[PDB]
Each structure stands twice: as structure tokens, then as C-alpha cells.
Design a protein around this ligand. Structure first.
Ligand SMILES: O=c1ccn([C@H]2C[C@H](O)[C@@H](COP(=O)(O)O)O2)c(=O)[nH]1
Length: 147
């Protein structure tokens, strides 16, 4: 089952916690301090925004650290207005036991740049309870490694 807002507030460490981000069954993660586009690190905190060029992907760090219990899985989707403007998120599962800020990939499929402001709500994470705790459950900066 999915956790409602009042259980998210109790069980998931989400810091810094933004009241306006809590949704009926999820939390709107915000654009954080760092992004990475076309080989270049962007200080989003300093610049106040990140601009995703047309037909280009970007890595964006969430403002929030999220810590999941060993019996909850995190499930992210882009916010609806950003999808309408041509963004697609490429998201992995957030494993039970995860603790950290998330590095999120967004692709701008449109022919026009798309801007996101520092601190803007951009991805809603929902939380799904596991039937029992994982036998083997699973961080403040962008992850920039590749295989
Ligand atoms: O889009 C996503 C999805 C997940 N994670 C975090 C939480 C996951 O548990 C973890 C998986 O990392 P690996 O164990 O695959 O390297 O990464 C991200 O940073 N971005």
C-alpha cells in the first residue's frame, strides 16, 4: 500500500521539509544546489535556476535528503506542468534503506529551453510499503560517475 501524507510526515526523513511539497500521497522534491549539463557543473543555488537546453538531458540534485525505512520503496514521477512543457524524467527506483539527496536525470524533448528555479517543486516521490522488511536493504552531491 502507498503511504498517505500524514504517514510520510511521520516515517520518512525529508530535510529540509517544505510544507507546500506534501501531497495527498507523496512529496514534491525541489530543485537543489547542483546540476550537470553537457559536461559542466552548474551552481543552481548561486545562479538561482538551471536551464535545460532543447533536446538535451540534465542531472539535477534534489534539495531534500530522503531517508527510506527498510520496508518502503520510493517511486518518482515528474510534476504535470513540467511534463506538459516537454520534460521527461528518467528515474530509477529509490531502494529501501536509501539515505541521501537524489541525482535525477531530466530530458528536455522540446525545441525550446526549459528553466527550473532553485527550490522549485519538480518531482513527486511516492512511498510504497513492502510486505515485509527486505532481507538485504540498501550522498549529498551529484553522482557523476559512469560505468
Ligand atoms: O533517479 C534516481 C533513483 C534513485 N536514486 C538513488 C536511490 C537508489 O536507491 C540509488 C540506486 O543507486 P545504485 O545502487 O544503483 O548505484 O540511487 C537516484 O539518485 N536517482
Amino acid at each position: 500500500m502507498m503511504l498517505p501524507d500524514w504517514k510520510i510526515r511521520k516515517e520518512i526523513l525529508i530535510e529540509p521539509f517544505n510544507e507546500k511539497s506534501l501531497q495527498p500521497a507523496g512529496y514534491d522534491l525541489r530543485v537543489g544546489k547542483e546540476a550537470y549539463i553537457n559536461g559542466r557543473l552548474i551552481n543552481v543555488e548561486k545562479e538561482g535556476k538551471v536551464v535545460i537546453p532543447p533536446k538535451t538531458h540534465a542531472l539535477i540534485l534534489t534539495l531534500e535528503r530522503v531517508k527510506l525505512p527498510d520496508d518502503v520503496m520510493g517511486d518518482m514521477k515528474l510534476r504535470s506542468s513540467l511534463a506538459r512543457e516537454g520534460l521527461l524524467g528518467s528515474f530509477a527506483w529509490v531502494d529501501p534503506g536509501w539515505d541521501g539527496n537524489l541525482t535525477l536525470m531530466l530530458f528536455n524533448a522540446s525545441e525550446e529551453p526549459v528553466e527550473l528555479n532553485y527550490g522549485e517543486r519538480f518531482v513527486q516521490i511516492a512511498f510504497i510499503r513492502l510486505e515485509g522488511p527486505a532481507k538485504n536493504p540498501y550522498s549529498q552531491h551529484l553522482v557523476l560517475s559512469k560505468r
